[PDB]
Amino acid sequence: SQAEFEKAAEEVRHLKTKPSDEEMLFIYGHYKQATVGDINTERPGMLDFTGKAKWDAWNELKGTSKEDAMKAYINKVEELKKKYGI
Ligand SMILES: [Zn+2]
Ligand SMILES: [Zn+2]
Ligand SMILES: [Zn+2]
Ligand SMILES: [Zn+2]
């Protein structure tokens, strides 16, 4: 649910270890897909390293329902809580 999405988005900030880059990109891309929906921005230039990585993670999800992105986000946070602790 949207309320559980809000809770997961809070809990992910309090993991005992910072998530890996792969995990951070999963979390970012699914967050954008669950909120904005399909990507609606142009890709950053080649030297915007963080920006283009973020954009790619969201772009890969094009066509995914907001409800599925939200479910995946929540499930990922639960996985991270078990992996790192909170
Ligand atoms: Zn739901
Ligand atoms: Zn890194
Ligand atoms: Zn920043
Ligand atoms: Zn996904």
Q: What DSSP string runs through 28-77?
A: HHHHHHHHT-S--SPPPPTT-HHHHHHHHHHHTTTT--HHHHHHHHHHHH
Is 31 annotated as a binding-site member?
yes
Resolution limit in angstroms?
Answer: 1.4
In angstroms, the CA 31 to CA 61 distance is 11
Find, among 84, 62, 75, 67, the residue nearest to 14 by Cα. 84
Q: How many angstroms separate the alpha carbon of residue 16 from the centre of ligand 4?
A: 24
33, with CB counted inside 10 A (0-12, 13-18, 19+), is buried
Sign, CA torsion 78/79/83/84: negative
**Residue 63 annotated as binding site:** no
3-state class (DSSP) for residue 18: coil
Give the closest residue to 7 by CA, choosing from 61, 86, 60: 86
Give distance in angstroms: CA of 1 to centre of ligand 2.
Answer: 30
The CA distance from 33 to 66, in Å, is 6
Cα 80 to averaged position of ligand 2 atoms, centre (Å): 17
Domain 1-86 has CATH 2.40.30.170: no
Q: Which of 78, 83, 76, 82 is nearest to 26 (CA)?
A: 76
DSSP class of residue 16 equals S
81 is in an annotated binding site: no
Which amino acid belongs to residue 81?
K
